[PDB]
């Protein structure tokens, strides 16, 4: 029984990530780097129109399993 979130982009297929509520946005950015090659300092993550800041965690943003994030380059 594990947690999955999703990352929507303009150009790529839906990305699936395996995460835990204690994971931070940098961790999520790091996992995005492994699957897509995009460097973390270039990524902006958005959940429900709210900017996701690297220091926080997913439980901070109330991101549950099955949530879909938005990714745009910065």
């Amino acid at each position: 029984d594990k947690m999955h979130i999703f990352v929507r982009t303009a150009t790529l297929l839906m990305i699936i990530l395996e995460v835990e509520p204690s994971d931070t946005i940098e961790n999520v950015k790091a996992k995005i780097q492994d699957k897509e090659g995009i460097p973390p300092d270039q990524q902006s993550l958005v959940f429900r129109r709210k900017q996701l800041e690297d220091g926080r965690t997913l439980s901070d943003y109330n991101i549950r399993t099955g949530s879909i994030l938005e990714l745009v380059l910065r």
Partner: protein
């Protein structure tokens, strides 16, 4: 964490739909929850719904694909097996569901239901009776509702 297998499967179907789009339908999440999809289908040709745009909602359970998704019309439609709340009476969504079934096959089945209703297993008996006894009256109303609500 409860729905790992469901989410992996839902994601696979989503990307499978993108790689090989259906001819007559589209489906995917429109919000920020992968468990909740929106779908659109064309009313089949040689049916009174021809040319209509019908929007549907798909709600996957956390034990998908062992349990079927909950599928309903948002567009109003005149049909013996679909009620005024958009609920659908379709076997593969109740007890003929199999985990080998996909949203792709469900959309095909819903399209088949619009072409050929099942009036002997109705959700709206009065509509089924018209379908059975006055086909042209049912065709007229279904066409008029397609213009009113799905165009």
């Amino acid at each position: 964490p409860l729905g790992s297998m469901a989410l992996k499967r839902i994601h696979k179907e989503l990307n499978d739909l993108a790689r090989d789009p259906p001819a007559q339908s589209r489906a995917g999440p429109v919000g920020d929850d992968m468990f909740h999809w929106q779908a659109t289908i064309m009313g089949p040709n040689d049916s009174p719904y021809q040319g209509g745009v019908f929007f549907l909602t798909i709600h996957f359970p956390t034990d998908y694909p062992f349990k079927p998704p909950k599928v309903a019309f948002t567009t109003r439609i005149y049909h013996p097996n679909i009620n005024s709340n958009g609920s659908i009476c379709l076997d593969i969504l109740r007890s003929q569901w199999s985990p080998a079934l996909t949203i792709s096959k469900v959309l095909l089945s819903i399209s088949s239901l619009l072409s050929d209703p099942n009036p002997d297993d109705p959700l709206v008996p009065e509509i089924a009776r018209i379908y059975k006894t006055d086909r042209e009256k049912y065709n007229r109303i279904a066409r008029e509702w397609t213009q009113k609500y799905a165009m």
